[PDB]
Structures are given as structure tokens and as C-alpha cells.
């Protein structure tokens, strides 16, 4: 999987 | 704008 | 504490 | 949106 | 000095 | 290029 | 409360 | 799971 | 070795 | 190649 | 001890 | 100059 960052500002890491 | 991380204990980002 | 990360997928810090 | 980083080098982060 | 992040998106560290 | 992580747990840098 | 870093250089991680 | 980093030096990312 | 942060406030890396 | 930052501040990360 | 990181691509922290 | 880190175990950031 790949791994990076999400932004909605709260800002999460995100799994893929 | 600036960024860096909030805690509530869980801690995410933040964009202001 | 320590501080690291928490995977639900999202992932944040924790600090226990 | 999605963040992560860009390579040029410099490596800056990009938010897409 | 404090260390956080900015945002133009580019994303760079600055230190103030 | 794109610079993240992947996860196979070990977790790296990537760099495409 | 906020995190970001401190610069003295020594740079450490600060929480407010 | 948790995450943070193992040393063995290489220094991966590791998830339990 | 295990690797990640601890919190006295100052937050420093540790290495176990 | 080795990876870490530099500070001109703009704070970039930097591969030799 | 100096810790940053090595390309190879993967990328892994390194400790000298 | 440039920025990483210093292990002594504590890690801090090092700006040279």
C-alpha cells in the first residue's frame, strides 16, 4: 500500500 | 498559510 | 508520554 | 485533497 | 527560533 | 517526481 | 494545544 | 496498530 | 531498536 | 544518495 | 551519531 | 546551512 497525508483544515495520514 | 499539529491524546495537522 | 502513530485507513499521533 | 512531496534537487511538499 | 510549515500548493518549512 | 511512503510491517520512503 | 518545533542549533519539538 | 520507527544502521518505518 | 518520541513542554526523539 | 534539509527562512529538503 | 536519510527508489533513514 | 538530526538515546534536530 501506499502511505501519504489527507487534508479536509485537519490534515490526517492516509493508508491506500 | 502556516501548518504544524494539534493535540487533543490524539495529535493530526492543521492548516490556519 | 510517548509520542507515535495510530492506524484505523487514517493515521494520527497519539501521545500515551 | 491530497499532500505529499515533489522532488526537483529540492524536495518540497505539494498539496494536490 | 519557532520551526513549522507554510503553504503557497508548495509546502515549505520556515523557521520565525 | 512523486516522493511518499509504502508499507509491505515495513514502512519506507518512495520515490517514483 | 499546539505542536511545532523550537530552534536554540538544537531543534526539539514543542507543545502550547 | 501503532506505528513508529525500528533501527537496525538502517531506520525503517514499522507497523504492529 | 524501537524508535519514536517522548513528551516532558519539550519533545524529543528516543531510541529504545 | 544522502536526504535531509536546508535552511536559507525557507527550509527545503535536499537530495545529494 | 548523525541520522538523515539514503535513496536508492527506496528511501530509509540512515544512522552514521 | 544545513538540517538533521543528532542521536546521543535522545535524537533532537541539528542545524549546521
Known sequence: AL???AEDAAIIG???
Open 3 to 5: 502511505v501519504f497525508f
Open 14 to 16: 492516509l493508508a491506500v
